[PDB]
Amino acid sequence: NRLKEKFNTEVTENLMKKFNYSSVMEVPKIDKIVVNMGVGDAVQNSKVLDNAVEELELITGQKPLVTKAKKSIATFRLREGMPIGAKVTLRGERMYEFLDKLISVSLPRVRDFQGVSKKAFDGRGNYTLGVKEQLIFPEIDYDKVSKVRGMDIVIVTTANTDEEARELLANFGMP
Amino acid sequence: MISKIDKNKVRLKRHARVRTNLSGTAEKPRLNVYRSNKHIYAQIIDDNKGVTLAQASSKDSDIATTATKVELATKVGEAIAKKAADKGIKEIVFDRGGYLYHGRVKALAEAARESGLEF
Amino acid sequence: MKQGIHPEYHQVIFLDTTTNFKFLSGSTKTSSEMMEWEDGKEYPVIRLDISSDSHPFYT
Amino acid sequence: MLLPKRVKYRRQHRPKTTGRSKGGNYVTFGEFGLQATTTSWITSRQIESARIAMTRYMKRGGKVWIKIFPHTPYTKKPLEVRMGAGKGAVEGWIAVVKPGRILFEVAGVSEEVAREALRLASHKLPVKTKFVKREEL
Amino acid sequence: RVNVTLACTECGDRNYITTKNKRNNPERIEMKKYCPRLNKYTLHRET
Amino acid sequence: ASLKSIIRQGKQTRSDLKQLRKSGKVPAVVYGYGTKNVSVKVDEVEFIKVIREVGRNGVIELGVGSKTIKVMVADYQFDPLKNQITHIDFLAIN
Amino acid sequence: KKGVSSTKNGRDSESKRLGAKRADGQFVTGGSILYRQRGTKIYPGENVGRGGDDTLFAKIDGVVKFERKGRDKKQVSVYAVA
């Protein structure tokens, strides 16, 4: 809760000047993040999906479980089964560690415009911004990789919308 | 835009989903339970008519310690079982509510079971 | 924390040569290259970091 | 009006004849309306004829609102052939009306002009009918 | 999805019948059920 | 503005009710402000004349019995065929 | 006569006699039927078995009471007062 404590001070200095809570038993927050990776078209690319797995096994403290295709949609031959996703959900102390890590080690390999973005919030209070996966993994950088992916990383927030995430990012965010 | 709620409502939804078949006839009268946060409360109740039969708890301080959040449940399971020793000292039907045969539940369960009662 | 699909996590001391940002995370609970206690005993060789040092918002 | 243009069933039943207009009994779209007195079938070829006459007399004047689509088919075999080894192809489409049912409206045109056009429409038409103004008061 | 007429452990004749398939259930199956010479649910096996 | 009606009664059968509606009058039934579920009949002619005098709405002190009180349309069962009314529903406004 | 051709759709089912068999106030037997249905239009209540095909029987002998079940559904309540 390193930067969480900074914006905790801002709950009383800024978002008591902004959100104006009636009790300290009521405050804002993010909840967590769901980090479902992408397609990983394992029709026979099961090993590619295993590489996408072992990426986030360690690049992320939690690893995914595959979203198997409940359906048989065209545009890629999915059927009942068809492991074609990822279920990462970073909740607590890992969530804060990833915060204090990634706000700082993303932009070195993001080449961002503002530093994170002007904006790419999808509109439900979250980014879900497709990544080129370079800014991520300073631990396993783009030296030995095998596959690019872009993920709809969903900011699972008590933020009612994206505007709250904006002024929330005093935490090394350039909104 | 993504939030949380009370838990007792879902407790009681499961409770209703079970209540159908497990029904105190006022002879195996319905022994319903409530573990809220701190102390667990209990009552066997004539429910074929919908009227009291007993009343006990862990906030009911006659059987009271600072044991576990659990051994106190065992105490109340002995105690209300003694309030049933007079009558209803037999096997009746408990209610697992939206709760489970483990924990507070099971400690109290076998407390009642072995405080004279035919469960 | 999807225990069942959760490998290790930790607050890693990913110290840099610039700004010493050893307040990071990863899966490599590293050796005591920086055998320190102000930050964890993790490898401080990860120097390339601009979001605090040389970023588009502040070079 | 309001629809996607599919169908549901083909050889529906030869429908009701009698009764009364359940609705469509007031002048809404246009101002100069026509309703009916009789209660019989319509093929829309008579109304094809009718609106032809109407327009070519109106000289591309005011507007028109038909209050109909023939929702329902009718069939026929060829002429006076033997009976009951099937039910023939649809020979067209219909929607019977009843008295009290508004059927046409127009606006952006003169009153007696409308009267004339409606007379002309009825003349190619199998049903006794009547013109009205905006049902008000 | 075809038939199976089983032989009991020792109940000694042709009584019990069911459905299975040699694709879902390609191998000889066996399970518990009441036979009459025993007054109990015993195991019986496929032949 | 001060039109007059008359007071209906029970079991207006298929015969007498058709007769009255066929006549130059028609049944109304009022309720609402200081009023009960009360049935009456009204001359079509002057009813329509007051339509022409005051329009779709007019605070009318309706003279039945001894009282001329503010009541207006709740609704009405009217036949566009034959251009006269079968039924009218009334609501007091005071 | 002449050519009349192939012809298909005269296919329907030899029916079944469903619904009720006994009524309000009526007195019954033990294996007595009270209804032949499919699904649950009505819901067995007191002293009522439900066989496989949604057939209902009264577990006892006695007399019947249909009634509401929910706020908008219906059931049975057999009573063997005597």
Added chain:
RNA sequence: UCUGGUGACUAUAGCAAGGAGGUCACACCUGUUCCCAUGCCGAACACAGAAGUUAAGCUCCUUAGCGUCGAUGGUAGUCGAACUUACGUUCCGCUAGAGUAGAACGUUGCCAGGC
């Protein structure tokens, strides 16, 4: 007198909204530390602390705004009867749906506290 449950009454019982309420419980809460624990979370559950809280959840109050039912009479529609031959007439009753006044923001048995 508020509570908990377990209750019977269908929401005109309520939906939504406003305000108060206060760790008699309540939930907020800190974690995994153990039983437990999550094919994919201490989320949940369980366990463990009760530190703190009505702000939430929460009960009460205010609107009937939403819903809800819903009158009055009336309508056809139908019963039969009699007509005549009408895409019908008439008596007779049964009287719908729909509209609509209008309404109501609960009764309530239950033990123990709370009292």
Added chain:
RNA sequence: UGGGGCGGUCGCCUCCUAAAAGGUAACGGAGGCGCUCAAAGGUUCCCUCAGAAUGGUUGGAAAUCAUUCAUAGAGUGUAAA
């Protein structure tokens, strides 16, 4: 068999005709069947809608994922109920 007639069809299940109990015709209207699940079965303990927009690597909008409503519109092995 609306003369024999060629054609066809001939055994079961769903609906509509069917007329508010049930029941009922037509060389009358529309549709399924000649099975399948050792797990889709039995039994305990959890879950709870598609879909819609919301929207964003994806993007042929949409896949996966995510916010909120959705009437079970989900869906349920085999048509319709």
Added chain:
RNA sequence: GAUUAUUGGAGGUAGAGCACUGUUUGGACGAGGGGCCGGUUACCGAAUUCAGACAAACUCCGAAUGCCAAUUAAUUUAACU
């Protein structure tokens, strides 16, 4: 056994009615395609409302009348094996 006053119930007809399913959008509605370079504007897929109209195989509603059975009551004379 019967008839009728008294019942009590079942049920989805007629009628109503769009609330689902949907049949023919008048209107606008904002966009997507599009005329254009990714756009302009048309119109639409579609949906937004407003908006109405229709239904053997549509139903949130819903009669009369008939069906079943009641100390059912009374007046008859059946009724059953």
